[PDB]
Write a protein that binds this ligand. Structure first.
Ligand SMILES: *[C@@H]1O[C@H](CO)[C@@H](O[C@@H]2O[C@H](CO)[C@@H](O[C@@H]3O[C@H](CO[C@H]4O[C@H](CO)[C@@H](O)[C@H](O[C@H]5O[C@H](CO)[C@@H](O)[C@H](O)[C@@H]5O)[C@@H]4O)[C@@H](O)[C@H](O[C@H]4O[C@H](CO)[C@@H](O)[C@H](O)[C@@H]4O[C@H]4O[C@H](CO)[C@@H](O)[C@H](O)[C@@H]4O[C@H]4O[C@H](CO)[C@@H](O)[C@H](O)[C@@H]4O)[C@@H]3O)[C@H](O)[C@H]2NC(C)=O)[C@H](O)[C@H]1NC(C)=O
Ligand SMILES: *[C@@H]1O[C@H](CO)[C@@H](O[C@@H]2O[C@H](CO)[C@@H](O[C@@H]3O[C@H](CO)[C@@H](O)[C@H](O[C@H]4O[C@H](CO)[C@@H](O)[C@H](O)[C@@H]4O[C@H]4O[C@H](CO)[C@@H](O)[C@H](O)[C@@H]4O)[C@@H]3O)[C@H](O)[C@H]2NC(C)=O)[C@H](O)[C@H]1NC(C)=O
Ligand SMILES: C[C@H]1O[C@H](O[C@H]2[C@H](O)[C@@H](O)[C@@H](O[C@H]3[C@H](O)[C@@H](O)[C@H](O)O[C@@H]3CO)O[C@@H]2CO)[C@H](O)[C@@H](O)[C@@H]1N[C@H]1C=C(CO)[C@@H](O)[C@H](O)[C@H]1O
Ligand SMILES: *[C@H]1O[C@H](CO)[C@@H](O)[C@H](O)[C@@H]1O
Ligand SMILES: *[C@H]1O[C@H](CO)[C@@H](O)[C@H](O)[C@@H]1O
Ligand SMILES: *[C@H]1O[C@H](CO)[C@@H](O)[C@H](O)[C@@H]1O
Ligand SMILES: *[C@H]1O[C@H](CO)[C@@H](O)[C@H](O)[C@@H]1O
Ligand SMILES: *[C@H]1O[C@H](CO)[C@@H](O)[C@H](O)[C@@H]1O
Ligand SMILES: *[C@H]1O[C@H](CO)[C@@H](O)[C@H](O)[C@@H]1O
Ligand SMILES: *[C@H]1O[C@H](CO)[C@@H](O)[C@H](O)[C@@H]1O
Ligand SMILES: *[C@H]1O[C@H](CO)[C@@H](O)[C@H](O)[C@@H]1O
Ligand SMILES: *[C@H]1O[C@H](CO)[C@@H](O)[C@H](O)[C@@H]1O
Ligand SMILES: *[C@H]1O[C@H](CO)[C@@H](O)[C@H](O)[C@@H]1O
Length: 470
């Protein structure tokens, strides 16, 4: 009713707002070079007029998926991004050069110059995210007969990022929130994915990624350590509880539509990800006045972590959208499978929504199933309603919304907020991303080793783009 139509409208707004934030024709970011995704046009309090590898990677992957689904007009935006990355990779910065750690640098100026002040650096998710976004585009180029562009432009760029991940995964750094110096689930999860799809891509182009192959299994091995028995620990080397939407993000950004409810990869429907889901969301129920009065079977406004004090610690549009997207993903998986399972690990999650929940296997034709799935859908939609309630009248999505009154705060028109909107809508409509090979990369080795593999680095120069038609 309100929701479906609001989403339809918001999706259009979200696409437009992202384009306005990408150089060099982006309406909100004059000064940004060609293909530079700006986090936000906000240049003062806060100053987000920079380009983050993470934000850009996430945004572009989203645009790539839209493109592959028929949004052909996004072609030049993607080409520009790729071209810009060829340059950025080579920018000498506080984290190093191309071959000596440069790839890990969190953000840059919109003009493609290094940001030299103090920052929580490096952030090792970046390279993984940029690689995943490029690989998707690379796959389309292969499928549509533009092998050369894939082999000579995309591969070489990806190869740099894959080498970095394989080389430093087992080293500390900052989390996606840029505040904890340690080992972060989100980072580890996206790094394992990148290596697996990086390897398949390498083969597709007639090359190889030996370092992708030796390291992926080891990253996976390590990933298991994040399960505490009741939830996913966001970070090692932290004094916090460990409950963080970092873990929801890790799950949705590594969702493979071909995968079952695999615990080893923390898929959306896995018992571990469902138990984690409740523990995370529940942590925001009594700390935000905006959540006052809601029951345990009701959607709530979700922040980053319960201990957050950034701008006082408020819910985030993207964190709230992620809580819904994980559910949309699990619905798709159960439906595709033709059953859902309730285990001791995930009982609390189900029991909060369907009080008659009991462990066992429920086929898609069973009454229990119908009852659970409707309840899950209503819950998932509830998170999206909170978003709709607090968005600006014209559809503007901010970074945060006030924990007490829901007013928008922090960076305005946050590009990441817009991409999160698109992906949650997509999943809601059963529009899923291409598979990354999870079905051949969920086996955990019997012994985890603290290791690395060094790949190879080489500077890429993009002379010209072939005249691609879509
Ligand atoms: C839905 O409607 C919304 C409501 O109208 C609409 O949002 C509005 O969009 C306009 C842009 O179209 C915004 O205008 C900008 O305002 C800047 C000042 O903002 C502060 O003051 C406002 C007035 O009191 C506040 O309302 C505003 O609050 C918002 O932002 C807060 C912080 O993020 C947030 O917490 C609040 O909740 C609220 O959301 C804020 O406090 C003003 O500075 C800016 O001017 C620049 O941009 C113009 C062009 O876009 C230029 O002509 C102008 O000269 C300035 O250019 C400089 O900055 C640009 C980047 O933004 C650069 O591209 C330029 O190159 C240039 O940069 C120079 O300076 C930099 C210094 O740091 C430097 O880094 C550069 O290198 C360079 O040297 C513009 O006027 C307005 O703020 C929005 N209002 C609200 C309430 O959000 C929204 O877009 C609509 N949505 C949709 C989907 O349509
Ligand atoms: C490089 O790779 C190696 C190999 O994979 C990594 O080594 C593994 O590291 C993990 C994490 O330290 C380690 O797991 C610990 O094992 C201990 C016993 O075997 C546990 O006592 C410890 O418990 C913590 O995590 C649990 C979840 O697994 C929680 O239930 C528990 O509450 C503990 O969590 C608290 O304490 C930790 C302290 O570690 C703190 O940081 C948290 O924030 C939280 O407060 C772990 O389970 C494996 O045993 C190691 N494996 C091997 C073979 O040595 C190495 O960590 C990698 N390094 C980097 C930088 O990436
Ligand atoms: C944008 C970012 O802002 C906050 O963190 C910043 C500090 O504001 C900044 O001053 C700097 O802090 C270092 C400090 O200057 C130095 O004196 C001290 O030694 O070390 C500090 C490093 O810990 O850098 C940090 C970032 O490292 C918030 O705490 C961050 O959560 C916030 N990140 C946002 C913004 C973006 C852009 O969209 C997202 O990529 C990110 O996920 C999100 O959390
Ligand atoms: C993930 O992949 C492993 C192999 O790596 C399978 O054994 C598992 O069933 C799942 O498909
Ligand atoms: C499943 O496959 C992994 C490699 O992907 C092995 O390390 C594991 O022991 C199991 O055979
Ligand atoms: C880390 O450890 C593995 C095996 O223990 C090695 O093969 C690798 O070269 C690195 O030293
Ligand atoms: C990654 O780090 C390992 C340490 O285990 C080295 O052996 C390897 O050569 C690469 O530097
Ligand atoms: C890791 O080490 C290799 C050598 O095995 C280098 O080629 C690479 O650039 C990185 O330093
Ligand atoms: C590592 O490998 C690449 C690809 O073979 C080389 O181009 C690079 O110079 C380094 O030797
Ligand atoms: C390493 O590889 C890149 C990508 O092909 C080249 O541009 C560079 O000349 C070196 O051979
Ligand atoms: C690869 O790196 C070189 C510098 O090492 C740059 O000149 C080139 O633009 C590309 O980024
Ligand atoms: C791409 O190729 C040029 C040579 O045409 C280099 O100068 C650049 O650093 C990158 O390797
Ligand atoms: C266009 O031209 C430059 C100069 O030969 C190359 O380095 C680049 O890889 C592309 O082929």
């Amino acid at each position: 009713a309100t929701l479906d139509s609001w989403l339809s409208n918001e999706a259009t707004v979200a696409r437009t707002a992202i384009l306005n934030n990408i150089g060099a024709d982006g309406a909100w970011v004059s000064g940004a070079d060609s293909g530079i995704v700006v986090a936000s046009p906000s240049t003062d309090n806060p100053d987000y007029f920079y380009t983050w590898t993470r934000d850009s990677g996430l945004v572009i992957k989203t645009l790539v998926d839209l493109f592959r689904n028929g949004d052909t007009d996004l072609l030049s935006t993607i080409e520009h991004y790729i071209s810009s990355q060829a340059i950025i990779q080579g920018v000498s910065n506080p984290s190093g050069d191309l071959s000596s750690g440069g790839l890990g640098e969190p953000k840059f100026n919109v003009d493609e110059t290094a940001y030299t002040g103090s920052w929580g650096r490096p952030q090792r998710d970046g390279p993984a995210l940029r690689a995943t976004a490029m690989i998707g585009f690379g796959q389309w180029l292969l499928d549509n007969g533009y092998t050369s562009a894939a082999t000579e432009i995309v591969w070489p760029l990806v190869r740099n990022d894959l080498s970095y991940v394989a080389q430093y995964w087992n080293q500390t750094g900052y989390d996606l929130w840029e505040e904890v110096n340690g080992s972060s689930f989100f980072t580890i999860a996206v790094q394992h994915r990148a290596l697996v799809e990086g390897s398949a891509f390498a083969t597709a182009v007639g090359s190889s990624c030996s370092w992708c192959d030796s390291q992926a299994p080891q990253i996976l091995c390590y990933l298991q350590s994040f399960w505490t028995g009741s939830y996913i620990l966001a970070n090692f080397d932290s004094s916090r509880s460990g409950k963080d939407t970092n873990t929801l993000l890790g799950s949705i950004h590594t969702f493979d539509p071909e995968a079952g409810c695999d615990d080893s990869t923390f898929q959306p429907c896995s018992p571990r990800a469902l138990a984690n889901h409740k523990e995370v969301v529940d942590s925001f129920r009594s700390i935000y006045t905006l959540n006052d009065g809601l029951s345990d079977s009701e959607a709530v406004a979700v922040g980053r972590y319960p201990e957050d004090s950034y701008y006082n610690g408020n819910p985030w549009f993207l964190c709230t959208l992620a809580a819904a997207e994980q559910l949309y993903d699990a619905l798709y998986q159960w439906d595709k499978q033709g059953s859902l399972e309730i285990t001791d690990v995930s009982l609390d999650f189900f029991k909060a929504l369907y009080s008659g929940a009991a462990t066992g296997t429920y086929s898609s034709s069973s009454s229990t199933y119908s009852s659970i799935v409707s309840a899950v859908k209503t819950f998932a939609d509830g998170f999206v309603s909170i978003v709709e309630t607090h968005a600006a009248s014209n559809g503007s999505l901010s970074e945060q919304f006030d924990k007490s009154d829901g007013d928008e705060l922090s960076a305005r028109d946050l590009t990441w907020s817009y991409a999160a909107l698109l992906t949650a809508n997509n999943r809601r409509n059963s529009v899923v991303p291409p598979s990354w090979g999870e079905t051949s990369a969920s086996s955990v080795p019997g012994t985890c080793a603290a290791t690395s593999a060094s790949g190879t680095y080489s500077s890429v120069t993009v002379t010209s783009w072939p005249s691609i038609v879509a």
